[PDB]
Design a protein around this ligand. Structure first.
Ligand SMILES: O=P(O)(O)OC[C@@H](O)[C@@H](O)c1c[nH]c2ccccc12
Length: 247
């Protein structure tokens, strides 16, 4: 991984020693980026609903993962499930139970730094994974991207700044997540996010991430060319909001 400080250094160390999960995979892969594209074609707002019990920025909600997922399944283009254990209170068991209960695409959200984690995602039932440019070196990112693709997954590659985007573009990313929140400082910057979105090639599927709680923010982002929206906190606090968001 890259030189890291603070909580990011810690979570990455936890990931390096994350035990692998052995399981047989039942359902074939359902492409999330292709489903986003077809929702775009049919003019339906594409929301990736995220499930997370806790977050380092303060979230702490008790809500049944299965019921939440089955409800979101009626509206969402896909689901994002946190499997990071220490800061997000996620687990592989949760991803496994959800994957067996819904039939929409599932993105496994964690801090992926080694190939076994992608093996875990595949064996657990996930359809794709998140790769974060800011914690990986360019060689690592390229290997992991190639590795995810060998399972037929197109990973969501997350950028937070211009240097992240140069790397993402250089390694041939086709599915990019623009995170308005800096993982290191936990600071949100809507403006920097807008600038980055505007620099991205039109043929890349773009997913806006973090801090979205209002339908107008979605409408604005959509006019900037964003294809999908990853929403977690506002939906965990109020699942019903999904009905306002897809109008
Ligand atoms: O809850 P929010 O503000 O809607 O944010 C969602 C999500 O995109 C944010 O969870 C996040 C973005 N990238 C990550 C990578 C790891 C863990 C968490 C994240």
């Amino acid at each position: 991984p890259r030189y890291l400080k603070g909580w990011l250094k810690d979570v990455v160390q936890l990931s390096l020693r994350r035990p692998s999960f052995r399981a047989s995979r039942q359902r074939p892969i359902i492409s999330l980026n292709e489903r986003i594209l077809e929702f775009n074609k049919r003019n339906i707002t594409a929301i990736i609903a995220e499930y997370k019990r806790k977050s380092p920025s303060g979230l702490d909600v008790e809500r049944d993962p299965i019921e939440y997922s089955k409800f979101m399944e009626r509206y969402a283009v896909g689901l994002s499930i946190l499997t990071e254990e220490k800061y997000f209170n996620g687990s592989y068991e949760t991803l496994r139970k959800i994957a067996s209960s819904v039939s929409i695409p599932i993105l496994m959200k964690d801090f992926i730094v080694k190939e076994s984690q992608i093996d875990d995602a595949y064996n657990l039932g996930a359809d794709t994974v998140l790769l974060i440019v800011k914690i990986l070196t360019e060689r690592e990112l390229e290997s992991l991207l190639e590795y995810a693709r060998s399972y037929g997954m197109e990973p969501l590659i997350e950028i937070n700044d211009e240097n992240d985007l140069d790397i993402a573009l250089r390694i041939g990313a086709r599915f990019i997540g623009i995170n308005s929140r800096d993982l290191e400082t936990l600071e949100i910057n809507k403006e920097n996010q807008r600038k980055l979105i505007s620099m991205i090639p039109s043929n890349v599927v773009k997913v806006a991430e973090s801090g979205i709680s209002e339908r107008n923010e979605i409408e604005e982002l959509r006019k900037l060319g964003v294809n999908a929206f990853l929403i977690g906190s506002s939906l965990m606090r109020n699942p019903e909001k999904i009905k306002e968001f897809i109008l």
